[PDB]
């Protein structure tokens, strides 16, 4: 199952995932492609931050879904 | 058809829409339900900002998709 | 998260809020602390009135921000 991950301005990247993959597992794959550490990625789908212990299936993320990648930094 | 609209931290609302509805029309529906003027709304789906002139079908936004709402904020 | 609420000439009140708390909830907390009915409260940040159905994070309000309370 392929999903897409995209920043607002950036290029779409394509990942092969299983519906049972955890968000942590997806972030590990994003780190391999874009270099951003998992703890500084946040993935947004359906207007919700995707929590790391949960699976793609939990959020009803299906084939061809596009996750929104934002950069999360400690500040303020 | 119903779609959902949600800010990152807020609870979701639903709008009654048609595939041919423009993003402009969607923003008008949001104003009707939430009191946010269309020019204070930034809408995101599939990691893309949605353009006012396009329609929902133009973005492959389907029944029970959730748009991500971000406010446009200005000092004063 | 800690935020502050001030009238222009009044005491500063500190509130415990969550980023996802709605302005309505924030007014409820001010009622609990200060005894001001929410219908008498207007909250302002960056010169703009904050609407009841929005959250603190909707308005990009960070920790230790000061909201201005007008009655």
């Amino acid at each position: 199952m392929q999903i897409f991950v995209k920043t607002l301005t950036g290029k779409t990247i394509t990942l092969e995932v299983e519906p049972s993959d955890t968000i942590e597992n997806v972030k590990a794959k994003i780190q391999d492609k874009e270099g951003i550490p998992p703890d500084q990625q946040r993935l947004i789908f359906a207007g919700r931050q995707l929590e790391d212990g949960r699976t793609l299936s939990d959020y009803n993320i299906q084939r061809e879904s596009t996750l929104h990648l934002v950069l999360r930094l400690r500040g303020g | 058809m119903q779609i959902f609209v949600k800010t990152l931290t807020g609870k979701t609302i639903t709008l009654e829409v048609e595939p041919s509805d423009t993003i402009e029309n969607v923003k008008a529906k949001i104003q009707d339900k939430e009191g946010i003027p269309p020019d204070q709304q930034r809408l995101i789906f599939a990691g893309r900002q949605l353009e006012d002139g396009r329609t929902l079908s133009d973005y492959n936004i389907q029944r029970e998709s959730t748009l991500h709402l971000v406010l446009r904020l200005r000092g004063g | 998260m800690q935020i502050f609420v001030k009238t222009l000439t009044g005491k500063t009140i500190t509130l415990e809020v969550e980023p996802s708390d709605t302005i309505e909830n924030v007014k409820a907390k001010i009622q609990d602390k200060e005894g001001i009915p929410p219908d008498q409260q207007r909250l302002i940040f960056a010169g703009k009135q904050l609407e009841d159905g929005r959250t603190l994070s909707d308005y990009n309000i960070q920790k230790e921000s000061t909201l201005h309370l007008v009655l």
Epitope: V70, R72, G76 | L73 | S20, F45, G47
Partner: nanobody, 119 residues
């Protein structure tokens, strides 16, 4: 390109440098702009932020040395008393607070400007 950094370069320790970020469209209307940096072999680190109320905040390691500001179409980072450890690629970004206190979600960020502080 919504955000374009410039004004980097090579500067001697103790010197000063002003970074600029040209902001296009309505990128400011997210309500929060920031600078973060990435030094060699290190993770990205928040440096300074400013919200639409004009409120600023700074990393502890730059507080008192760096000043963030913005005009109608530019975010600035005035960097005084530069130190070798300020060497990094510096990025401007626009974003929002999230569900957890003390974190910023940057939705847009630039390509970066290199700052090198020599001795």
């Amino acid at each position: 390109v919504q955000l374009q950094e410039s004004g980097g370069g090579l500067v001697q320790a103790g010197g000063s440098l002003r970074l600029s970020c040209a902001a296009s469209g309505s990128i400011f209307d997210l309500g929060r702009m920031g600078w973060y940096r990435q030094a060699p072999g290190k993770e990205r680190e928040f440096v300074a932020g400013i919200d639409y109320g004009g409120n600023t905040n700074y990393a502890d390691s730059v507080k008192g040395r760096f000043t963030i500001s913005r005009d109608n179409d530019t975010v600035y980072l005035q960097m005084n008393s530069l130190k070798p450890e300020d060497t990094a690629v510096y990025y401007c970004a626009a974003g929002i607070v999230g569900d957890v206190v003390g974190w910023i979600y940057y939705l847009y960020w630039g390509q970066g400007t290199q700052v090198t502080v020599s001795s």
